[PDB]
């Protein structure tokens, strides 16, 4: 029956020399990519955590990394005010994306992987051409740093979030705003992403709350609480390979897993020794990756039987 998951620690991935900022599984399921304040990207085996390579070139720390759909490219977002596009097999920087005027905080490819979206401390969202490395559009999107950016499943929409308390949905082709989601209040919105069915947006706010939104109708459907999140922009996820969960890091050093429908906490994963800034869910297997800040600096791989 829909039984609770039993995620258990299988591997701990050491090697970053400063806080880890982001981990992401490759769409083909083979790899995990991590970014860090240490200015490095590392690649690891998705199933056994095996260290594969280090990818270097940024001049300052990296806050986010993201895969192309074919698992061959990565893009990274850095305090050096650039994004870089990387060929994962060679480790070579293909393009440096220049235009932001402050730290680049978040990034993603669209599904066709001909575009990249970025968000920055400069309060803008930018849309970039992967082939040329040119900025196509600069959106005056927010009135505070942009914490997250994500394309929907056909690349026609971008969702963005900001410390200004807004979540906005943009038309990719024109760069114009389709919708602003605001609630009864405007705590900072620290993370957003579209759901695997394209229908919902998951949004984190720095009042220790996650919310599931129907974005067509513009309304909140579910609220998830019990974790600690008032300071950091922590990644959250839909887990869909087994039971239907919401997964998030927490400032009490735990990974939280909720039942998406009932909103109950079903598991808390103990082991990290600093804020769990990032979690990710494997595309086909019941595997979670988590990563933590300065006092820990490791990535952990957890596996469940369901």
């Amino acid at each position: 029956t829909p039984v609770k998951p039993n995620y258990a620690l299988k591997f701990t991935l050491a090697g970053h020399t400063k806080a880890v900022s982001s981990v992401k599984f490759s769409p083909n399921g083979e790899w995990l990519a991590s970014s860090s304040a240490d200015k490095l990207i590392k690649i690891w085996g998705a199933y056994d955590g095996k260290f594969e390579k280090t990818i270097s070139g940024h001049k300052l720390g990296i806050s986010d990394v993201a895969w192309s759909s074919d698992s061959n490219l990565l893009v990274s977002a850095s305090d050096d005010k650039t994004l870089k596009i990387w060929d994962v097999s060679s480790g070579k920087c293909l393009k440096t994306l220049k235009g932001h005027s402050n730290y680049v905080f978040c990034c993603n490819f669209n599904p066709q992987s001909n575009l990249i979206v970025s968000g920055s401390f400069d309060e803008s969202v930018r849309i970039w051409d992967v082939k040329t490395g040119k900025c196509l559009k600069t959106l005056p999107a927010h009135s505070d740093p942009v914490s997250a950016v994500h394309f929907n499943r056909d690349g026609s929409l971008i969702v963005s979030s900001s410390y200004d308390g807004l979540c906005r949905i943009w038309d990719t082709a024109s760069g114009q705003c389709l919708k602003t989601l605001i609630d009864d209040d405007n705590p900072p919105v620290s993370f957003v992403k579209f759901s695997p069915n394209g229908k919902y947006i998951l949004a984190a706010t720095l009042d220790n709350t996650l919310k599931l939104w129907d974005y067509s109708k513009g309304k909140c459907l579910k609220t998830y609480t019990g974790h600690k999140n008032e300071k950091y922009c922590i990644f959250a996820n839909f887990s869909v390979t087994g039971g239907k969960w919401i997964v998030s890091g927490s400032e009490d050093n735990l990974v939280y897993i909720w039942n998406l429908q009932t909103k109950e906490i079903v598991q808390k994963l103990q082991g990290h020794t600093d804020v769990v800034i990032s979690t990710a869910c494997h595309p086909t297997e019941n595997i979670i990756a988590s990563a933590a800040l300065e006092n820990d600096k490791t990535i952990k791989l957890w596996k469940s039987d369901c």
Partner: peptide
Amino acid sequence: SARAXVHLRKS
């Protein structure tokens, strides 16, 4: 990494 508390975003 700006992502890796409160002080930078309020500075």
